[PDB]
Design an enzyme around this catalytic site. Structure first.
Site, short mmCIF file in Angstrom:
data_model
loop_
_atom_site.label_atom_id
_atom_site.label_comp_id
_atom_site.label_asym_id
_atom_site.label_seq_id
_atom_site.Cartn_x
_atom_site.Cartn_y
_atom_site.Cartn_z
N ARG B 38 59.65 -67.56 2.31
CA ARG B 38 59.80 -67.79 3.77
C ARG B 38 58.46 -67.61 4.49
O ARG B 38 58.25 -68.29 5.51
CB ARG B 38 60.84 -66.82 4.33
N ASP B 62 62.53 -72.46 3.08
CA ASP B 62 63.89 -71.87 3.09
C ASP B 62 64.75 -72.76 2.20
O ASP B 62 64.85 -73.96 2.50
CB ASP B 62 64.40 -71.76 4.52
N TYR B 155 78.82 -62.77 -1.37
CA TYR B 155 77.85 -62.80 -2.50
C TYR B 155 78.61 -63.20 -3.78
O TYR B 155 78.20 -64.16 -4.46
CB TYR B 155 77.20 -61.43 -2.61
N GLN B 251 81.76 -53.32 -20.19
CA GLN B 251 82.85 -52.31 -20.00
C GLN B 251 83.73 -52.74 -18.84
O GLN B 251 83.31 -53.55 -17.99
CB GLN B 251 82.30 -50.90 -19.74
MG MG Z 1 84.00 -54.12 -16.10
#
Ligand code: MG
Ligand code: MG
Lengths: 251, 251, 251, 251
Positions: B38, B62, B155, B251
């Site tokens: 940027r 951008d 996200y 995990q």
């Molecule tokens: Mg996990």
């Protein structure tokens, strides 16, 4: 160049195809290598073809042979010093659906493809932990660790077992600061002399409905990801699956 | 050494952290690199810090700016010749649950993390296909492309989108023999100046319940898998996810 | 109500916990049920507790006993007519890392958790195909078919094996129009008398870092998804994994 | 029978195909239902065809319309009392590769398939938490949330986004004891009037290389798994993917 400086690698089924390519690139990147195979004639020729005994040697072994694993680690340490790197690559196939698998076929395939990988992984953790080796166990799987094939029932069982067993080993090694990583590699279809010996196999495997790239891979495709996973470049990768399959599992 | 011989790479968000490490290792392996960011102050300093203008340059951009993508490909081709390699790395974060995400926050994050990656991937296929470049698009994702985080809702949406959109692009490129591969890279937690600027962040991210290895990664951990995916070593890998996460997702 | 009209179900390990809840709901939805278990005392009491011999009976069996599988199908067909539905639920645990698993422990666990499921699946396809029964094989797995646990190495191997072996069986049955579906069910932590007998187990399993819901499940949680998979409601579901885990694998 | 006793459900795109079948079975299991659709003619006919206004009503809505979501929850609560159950089913398709997707096509599809699902999920958590409703958000995805299709690039992006965004929402709701579950449903190919209107579509979708069962599904296949996920039978399932695809993703 020198990406495996100082590494000492055992590669099971390292006398042919994928295993031989891993051994070749491991030596080319500075690793000392012990390849295993069932047959002395093929194994001694294979080792000599890659390099001199200071670089690579052969050890006759069936990966299903538990006691032989102790002899293999001992022979490799005697030749090259402490083992840092294990590639559990030795594997066999049965062309049967689950329905049409005999119990004999089931036990024979799991002896190599599952017991053998367990025996190598367990002994590898014991012998390579807490030695500052940057130790790496690479458990060879395949696309059949992710997706079924209706005519590879026992093979599917073995590849799924190794896939998740490897995550257990990765976590235990990580949580205990063993300096041992465990990952799985999942080839799609790879061209080898064995595939060339089966008329029509490569063309069936190259069909867009199987391999989107419209051709199969070559042994070096699997050697290169194995160099990355054996090297300290991958020191933050553990418990992961690495797929090299020409798009097979993406569709 | 020379693992990216002749490659020409665009790395979005290449002025900081993971992007800067990818740029550094790309130059060290013989690629010509255009990094984007940027801010001119940070970008020009970053490029100079890695190498000379014959090796690496900065382009202010951008990744959400669609027209700017055309200018970026044109500036890179003018400097270095035809682009072979795109790393869609530019990304932003919102620390909100889905429940507590404003529509403004939602659109701002998707503009960079999803639209930007779409714009880069689409233009990359158009500009890099059928040129014998061994072209490679590396779409940066994260562990949040695989598993939810209750406080990264938008996200998560962006990382899941890029994960599966990349498989679509991989398959189309493979089936049409475009000589373009598309793969995703999924870092776990990586130490950067930005993480160092957040008190307690690294220790929370290093908890065994988050990262089994009990520490977070470093930018070079992501640079090394990107070298493999940009290189012709990975010519049979397309439509795949490559996880480097210290065991987070195991995990 | 009557969701399993006319179905005839074998449930291995059906005398306790999850298996007993599946048997209870299967009878409540109109299925005729044969439950298996190691011990006559527990098994006869269990069957009587659910219903009358016209609804549910007990057959003493170790799922690792290959010949006993033939006797089990024969006893169930004699009692209730042709078997339509198999729930491979019988399983055991070893609390060892891969490193600390003895070969004896490895073989004992795989005999039940893998061989037993193979024996049941193979015989089930043979005995239930091409009979218009709307046949359904439900292979009990767990979250340990998806993610490693550092202290369940052999258990992880068995659950990964069953996960992918089931997809092979599903595909072969589908491609051959056998009228047999194969799916896996993946419980997270479930409260049972056996869990109640282990001090601290439920609280450790209920930690938000393990089960996001902050409590563990109950046997009926697994019974209800099994009713769906045994019923003709799920006639388009085959080769799928069904997770009921309080969010364990979502993070 | 009465599996959704007392539940109040919003089903977006509930006037046709999968959405209409979910609405039909929801009413048959005792839920009060508000179906949405773009067109009053189709919507009013659809509601009347399932039941009386005391059981099911229509609300004209574009799922991309953020303000309309507030009106929809208000209209449903006025008619039937507090909403317990949301099925985000409204979706559109673009038949383009990523390469050949216009920015207009990209934004139009994400407005419905991603923004719409975000808007419904966010408002659903806000309006249904902490009310002892046994609240359930079912986010409709598809096989294209798991695997790429080279000619559904934007569609793939939307389905991957919803897949992982739903896990974020599931975890936040679980950790905060909101009494709200979030899961995704992933149909394979389903026969609808819209599929019947496309010559050759069903036969191409029924090819063994696409759907191993050699035929496509029917709307009730998706209705039945939605009944399970809306019901308190699934009170331990959150953050999970439920695939009903005739084996598509198993190979
Ligand atoms: Mg996990
Ligand atoms: Mg597939």
């Amino acid at each position: 160049s020198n990406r495996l400086d100082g590494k000492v690698a055992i590669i099971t089924g390292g006398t042919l195809g994928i295993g031989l390519a891993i051994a070749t690139k491991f030596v080319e990147e500075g690793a000392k290598v012990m390849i295993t195979g069932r047959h002395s004639d093929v194994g001694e020729k294979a080792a000599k073809s890659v390099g001199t005994p200071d670089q690579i040697q052969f050890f006759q072994h069936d990966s299903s042979d538990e006691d032989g694993w102790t002899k293999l680690f001992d022979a490799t340490e005697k030749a090259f010093g402490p083992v840092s790197t294990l590639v559990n690559n030795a594997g066999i196939a049965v062309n049967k659906s689950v329905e049409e698998t005999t119990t004999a076929e089931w036990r024979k395939l799991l002896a190599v493809n599952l017991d053998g990988v367990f025996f190598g992984t367990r002994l590898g953790i014991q012998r390579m932990k807490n030695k500052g080796l940057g130790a790496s166990i690479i458990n060879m799987s395949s696309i059949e660790g992710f997706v079924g094939d209706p005519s590879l029932g026992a093979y599917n069982a073995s590849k799924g077992a190794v896939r998740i067993m490897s995550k257990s080993a990765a976590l235990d090694c990580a949580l205990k600061d063993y300096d041992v990583r465990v990952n799985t590699v999942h080839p799609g279809y790879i061209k080898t002399p064995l595939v060339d010996d089966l008329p029509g196999a490569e063309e069936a495997m190259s069909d867009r409905t199987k391999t989107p790239m419209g051709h199969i891979g070559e042994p070096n495709d699997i050697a290169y990801i194995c160099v990355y996973l054996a090297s300290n470049e991958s020191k933050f990768a553990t418990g992961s699956e690495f797929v090299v399959d020409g798009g097979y599992t993406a569709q």
